Amino acid sequence: YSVCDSESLWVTDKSSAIDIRGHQVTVLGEIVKQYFYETRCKEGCRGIDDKHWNSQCKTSQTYVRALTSENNKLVGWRWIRIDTSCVCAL
């Protein structure tokens, strides 16, 4: 049993994302096709104390390299962030 519920899925339609520098970049479609595996919360936490403990489930993210571009041109690998898990916050 988990404290938070999640759902994982294969994302084939991503075309924009925020990179490590906070910029909005275009995520290319091919590299072989470029798709991503993400897992986000579904939606207190299960098994929590609640008495002197408040909790909510939050979906965390992480960095993965993606072949992206900016104002088009400048195509290359950059670190973009995607949903990767669902964790509890007290």
Added chain:
Amino acid sequence: YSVCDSESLWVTDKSSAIDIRGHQVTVLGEIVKQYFYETRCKEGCRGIDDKHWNSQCKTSQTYVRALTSENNKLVGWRWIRIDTSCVCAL
């Protein structure tokens, strides 16, 4: 405050990994260099009930594409799994 403690880091020395098919593949060094961002548990869970609730923190994984090869030759993109977060189990 989180229920489980973790540590994230940049991995530059990965050279082997298990892919989605359960095989052991060689992870190449270059593609630009190929490195990974992972986050694993540090090390019950914080804020848990413990009374009629047992919990341990476990590090979860996820799939990311990596330029890998097998018995060498056959170089290409495959889905390999890496540590991505630390979640509580009841």
